[PDB]
ETEA protein (Homo sapiens), 67 residues
Amino acid sequence: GSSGSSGAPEERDLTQEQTEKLLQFQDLTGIESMDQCRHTLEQHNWNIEAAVQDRLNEQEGSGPSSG
């Protein structure tokens, strides 16, 4: 909006690979807050496969299990 950035004088840039992964997860999951996304990822260790599960597992829209 109008100069409203609360944080520290730091900068964290991701890598192409990682970035891409995010895009995927983001789309898959559907989270808005990018951070939130990378979060679930970082945790699982940028493991969409897991992050995805940990994402769904923890409160899902519709469909607890598939197959």
Remarks:
- The CA atoms of residues 17 and 23 lie 10 Å apart.
- The two ends are 45 Å apart (CA to CA).
- The longest helix spans residues 16-29.
